[PDB]
């Protein structure tokens, strides 16, 4: 399974694939850091133009804010509780002062 | 500070050990003609700029050139910076800087 | 109608002004705000126009008659205006912004062309005058306070602590200390410059109080200068007298109650023209008016439905 | 031309033969010099305000942002009421709806600021030549 | 018509515009007048040497 | 520090202990570096001689060599420095014969994982240069054709 990608520069992640696989042979070599079992995870990166290319799938894996979203509908809370807290205290929040924005945050 | 300081302290001295390893990916990612485009908004001015703030992170002298700072002294300062509460609140609304 | 001796005035998140007699707490006026909140008030020395500034604009408001409308008002700025003032003649009007400029405007309607920028690295908070109108206190978010001379074009550089910002500075009338408050509740105070001929703006570093120990927000002194109060974030005001720079009078608002988790911060102050009461305004949706000696309030002003973190409070000169 | 270099100022800025496709056979009033005898019309103020007016409606053609085009042409008609009241401006502006396509809400919108005028000059030479 | 209404009802507006006082910030100023400034914006009246007291006043008819 | 004098010390120091055991590999990387890291000195410094880089140069590519073939599965810097050089200084004629000779000794399964390297710069205007990236490519497809 892969995924299709359009509209993006995928040369760039080619290169930093390339360095997360030498950071990982870095950390394999170390008797202190391979005893830790420490690594990165990386996908395939492949692209085929200037403005298309083709990343692997990773399974298994869901994103973090999709994760917290079905927690929180299942018991009933609002997914921006928070947010809505510091509208109703400051509905100009956007605008405030480094100092105010800190009370309100 | 349990197991994410003491992951960070390890790491931290791995990178400096192998400083020349991870400069020579980078040298030759910055220096792309067809490829640092993205990052030019003479010539090849900025490039020579960026490499410096990278060799100044990998050798500690990043929050303060005339110091070399040490890895346990290193890691807790980004900590104080990645947590505080005024560098948290600028940050915008979609990055959900409260989760 | 600002046909009086006293006046006072509260604004915050409210999107409205509104103008209060220490009398009785009867609301006189309401004036409308809309689209922005205010950062700091202040009126003229002339008592006749009010200025109010936030977010790019600074509108002002008439007193005389009963308009809610901003009769005059400024743009030009990008960023939000930190705070506002004018000259003891009402001949310009200087204000910082949070645009890294602090700039002085012009009140004549002809071509003086009486307008001077100074440009810094960093955002700017406060912004003080010196007594004699002549020198200019300028302080950044980097912990450097900028001493701007009116008769020149240089500014000395002064650094007490790097990495923390400064939230406010001000100079009693008399002349006779300097007072300023950062990020971690520490208060610097240097003596001022004795060269009254030449003004050879010499600073020394005097005394340092530790006080505060949660956010230090406004440090504002007395017009008779034998007090200084600074407000903070822990809902406590401390007076200081100016002899040893010891306790003279503690305030606070806080309940007792852990339920509350510090329900409101404490926002800005302001003496009386005897340095008797003093008015204070907290973020909890109302001001109060306190007594320096007996510490329990006077009175409280509740019309407002949001949070107020600035107030604009003078009276007669004589006092 | 005014297309060019309105962009680069104001029409406040400015103020502190106009008509450029006008020619003596494709206007209501000048085309009758010759062939029925009627006498040349009468009047840099009102030559500033001929080339914004038009400017406008060829920005009109494009429909791209039809509401900011259509606010900076009700200002014209508050300000200065009497910049429509021009039979050569109407032939001007008639000869471009037919070349051009413009939208039908945007074709009502025109032609119709026109609607509520006397022209004066048209009603005085044909009398006089009628009788 | 259509805008027959639309342009009576922009005049509505226009009166209730009119009522404010706007000031822009030209970038100019005294660049040139350089000795000038010593007095332009530098009058630095420095003076009130002589202190006076008060008998609190201010607050006698407040309270 | 890094010295216009300690600069010459150093590399006795080091170009003694290579002699004296070789097959080394912290010898052969670590002065092959400073070969490189003397090149890169001087050319600031004269930009603030083609015969003052070129003794230099050539001990920089022959040291970088040998150690490739001496790692053997972690050679992924020296494998890298040796195209900073190639693509900057291999114009001058003296250095091709030292990369002619090191691109056939060492094994071909080597430059596999530099290819995105190699294919970014195919468009260099520089025709001596030019052609010796071609013939390794090809001779990469003869070998590994479904890689490239
Ligand atoms: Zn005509």
Known sequence: VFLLKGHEDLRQDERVMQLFGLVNTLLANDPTSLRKNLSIQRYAVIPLSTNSGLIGWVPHCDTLHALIRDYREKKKILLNIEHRIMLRMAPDYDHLTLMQKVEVF | DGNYRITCHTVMEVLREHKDSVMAVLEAFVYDPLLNWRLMDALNKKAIQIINRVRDKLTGRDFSHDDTLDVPTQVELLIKQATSHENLCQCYIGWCPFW | VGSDPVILATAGYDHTVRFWQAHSGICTRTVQHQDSQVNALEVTPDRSMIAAAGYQHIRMYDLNSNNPNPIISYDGVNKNIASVGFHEDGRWMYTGGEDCTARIWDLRSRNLQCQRIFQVNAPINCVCLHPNQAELIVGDQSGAIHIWDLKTDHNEQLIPEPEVSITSAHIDPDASYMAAVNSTGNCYVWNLTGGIGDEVTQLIPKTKIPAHTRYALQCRFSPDSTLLATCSADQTCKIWRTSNFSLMTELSIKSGNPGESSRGWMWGCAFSGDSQYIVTASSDNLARLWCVETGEIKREYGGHQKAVVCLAFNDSVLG | SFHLLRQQMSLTEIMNTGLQEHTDDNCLYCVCIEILGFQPSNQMCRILLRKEVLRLVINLSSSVSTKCHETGLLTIKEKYPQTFDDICLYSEVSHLLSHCTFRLPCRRFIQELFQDVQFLQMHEEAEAVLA | ?63 | GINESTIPKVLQYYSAATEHDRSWYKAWHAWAVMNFEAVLHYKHQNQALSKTLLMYTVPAVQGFFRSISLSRGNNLQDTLRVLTLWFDYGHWPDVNEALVEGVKAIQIDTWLQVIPQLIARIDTPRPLVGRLIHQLLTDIGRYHPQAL
């Open chain 5, 1 to 63: 018509s259509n805008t027959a209404q639309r342009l009576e009802r922009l005049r509505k507006e226009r009166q209730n515009q009119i009522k404010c006082k706007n000031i822009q910030w030209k970038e100019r100023n005294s660049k040139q007048s350089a000795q000038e400034l010593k007095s332009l914006f530098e009058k630095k009246s420095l003076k009130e040497k002589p202190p006076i007291s008060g008998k609190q006043s201010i607050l006698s008819v407040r309270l």
